[PDB]
Structure formats: C-alpha cells, structure tokens
C-alpha cells in the first residue's frame, strides 16, 4: 500500500502495452535491418515491464540508512536501466553506422553510470552518496557528448531521412536523460526534498517517454529500412 504504487501500476501498464504493440508490428515486418531495430527496441520496454511489475509487487525495494534515517531505495530501477540504456544507445549507434569502438566505449560508459549510480544509491554515508552521484553523472555527460557531437557527425553521411530521424531521437534522449540525475539529486536517493510518490511519477514519465516514446518515433520511421 505504498503511495507510489499507483505510478508503478501505470508504468507497468504503459510498458506492457508498448511491448506488445512493438512485438506485433515487429513480427509482421520482413526486412532484415528493420527486424534488428525491432528486436532491440521491443526488448527495452520488455525489461522495463518486468521490473516495474516486480516493484509493483514489492520487490527491488530496500532500506538504506543515511542522514539518521531509514530510507526506501528502489534498486530494481538499476537492473532495468543497466540493460535498457545500452540497448537504447545501440539503437542510435546502428542508425548512424557508428564505429565498433565507439559503441564499446559508450556501453562501457553506460555500465559505469548505472553501476556507480547504484553504489551511490546504497551508500550509507550521506556525503559519499553524492560522490558516486557525481561520477555517474560525469559518465552520463560523456555519453551525451558523444551522441551530440560524435553521432551527429556520423549521421551527416547518411541519407537525409536517416539523419532527420536520428536528430529527433538524439534530442529526445538528451532532454530526458539529463533529467534523471537531477531527479535522483532532489529525490529519495539524494536530498530527500521530493517525496518518493512524486519521484516515482517523475521517473515513470521519463522512463515511458524514453522507452515507448523513443520506440514509437524510431519504429514508425523509414530510417530503419535496409
């Protein structure tokens, strides 16, 4: 009966619907290249759907003590993000033909961001929580710098239609991702200013927008076509 459950139920529903819709459209398409984008992009909200469900049912939540209090931390989010954020990057990476080393570096950075974020989430010394938060956000910025400067340049060599689709997704990604560290900062994991219920709502709106929103834009485009 935690108050944030209503948002966990809506994120479950939205992610589940989104998965089904993408699966249905995906299995209908025969183009090889398009099927690859569909397979990657249907997996993302799939993973998110299972995690939101678990949390809705009481899993992935633990009490961490810091600030002289017992604080409720949803660690199931990091298990979701660990695998969905690199898959989203792969989507963007395939669109622009990015180099294999570039992708290895991104995913690597991404592993670090999610890994330090979680360590930071679980840290019992208040001050140190933000030390882990800082590194994680530093890793995040590296990724955004690459997608904005690096990937946009590679996109330049693709047809206009492919480059156009990437810019939209690149913008969607940049705007949504940069909002996660601030939410963590002022929410349950950080300053404890925004309450967990509201925080769950914020992450749900970002999550769904970043997965199903991102998906709808990518999968409805001509750009995934070989």
Ligand X SMILES: *C/C=C(C)/C=C/C=C(C)/C=C/C1=C(C)CCCC1(C)C
The site for ligand X (CB under 6 A) is made up of: 48, 81, 84-85, 88, 113-114, 117, 133, 136-137, 140, 177, 180-181, 184, 207, 210-211
Tell me whether residue 29 or residue 144 sits nearer to ligand X (CB atom): 144
Of the pair 29, 50, the CB lying nearest ligand X is at: 50
The label of the residue with tokens 């939101």 reads 52
Q: Gaps after which residues in the chain, C–N over 2.5 Å? A: none
Give the shortest CB-147-to-ligand X separation in angstroms: 11
Report in angstroms how near the CB of residue 138 gets to ligand X at its nearest. Answer: 8
Question: 67 vs 159, which CB is nearer to ligand X?
Answer: 67
Length of the chain: 226
Q: How far is the CB of 54 from ligand X (least distance, A)?
A: 15
> Which of these, 91, 82, 86, 99, lies nearest to 36 by C-alpha position?
91
State in angstroms the smallest separation of the CB of 27 from ligand X. Answer: 23
Residue 73 vs 223, nearer CB to ligand X: 73
Distance CA 171, CA 118 (A): 26
Measured distance CA(108)–CA(225) in Å, rounded = 28
Residues 8 and 53: their CA atoms lie apart, in Å, by 7
With CB atoms as reference, the residue minimizing the distance to ligand X is 117
Which regions of the chain does DSSP assign to beta strands (E)? 61-66, 69-74
Find the shortest distance in angstroms from Cβ 32 to ligand X.
26
Q: Quick one: tokens of 180?
A: 């996660």
User: Judged by CB, which is closer to ligand X: 92, or 114?
Assistant: 114
């Amino acid at each position: 009966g935690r108050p944030e459950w209503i948002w966990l139920a809506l994120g479950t529903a939205l992610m589940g619907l989104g998965t089904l819709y993408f699966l249905v459209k995906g299995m209908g398409v025969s183009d090889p290249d398009a099927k690859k984008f569909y397979a990657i992009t249907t997996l993302v909200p799939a993973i998110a759907f299972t995690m939101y469900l678990s949390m809705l049912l009481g899993y992935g939540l633990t009490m961490v003590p810091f600030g002289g209090e017992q604080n409720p931390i949803y660690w199931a989010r990091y298990a979701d993000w660990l695998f969905t954020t690199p898959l989203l990057a792969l989507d963007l990476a395939l669109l622009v033909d990015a180099d294999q080393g570039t992708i290895l570096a991104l995913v690597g950075a991404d592993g670090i961001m999610i890994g330090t974020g979680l360590v930071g989430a679980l840290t019992k010394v208040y001050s140190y929580r933000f030390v882990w938060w800082a590194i994680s956000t530093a890793a995040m910025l590296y990724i955004l710098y690459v997608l904005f400067f690096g990937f946009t340049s590679k996109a330049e060599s693709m047809r206009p239609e492919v480059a156009s689709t990437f810019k939209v997704l690149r913008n969607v990604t940049v705007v949504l991702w940069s909002a996660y560290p601030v939410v963590w900062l002022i929410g349950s994991e950080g300053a404890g200013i925004v309450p967990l219920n509201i925080e769950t709502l914020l992450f749900m709106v970002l999550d769904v927008s970043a997965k199903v929103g991102f998906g709808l834009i990518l999968l409805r485009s001509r750009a995934i076509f070989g």
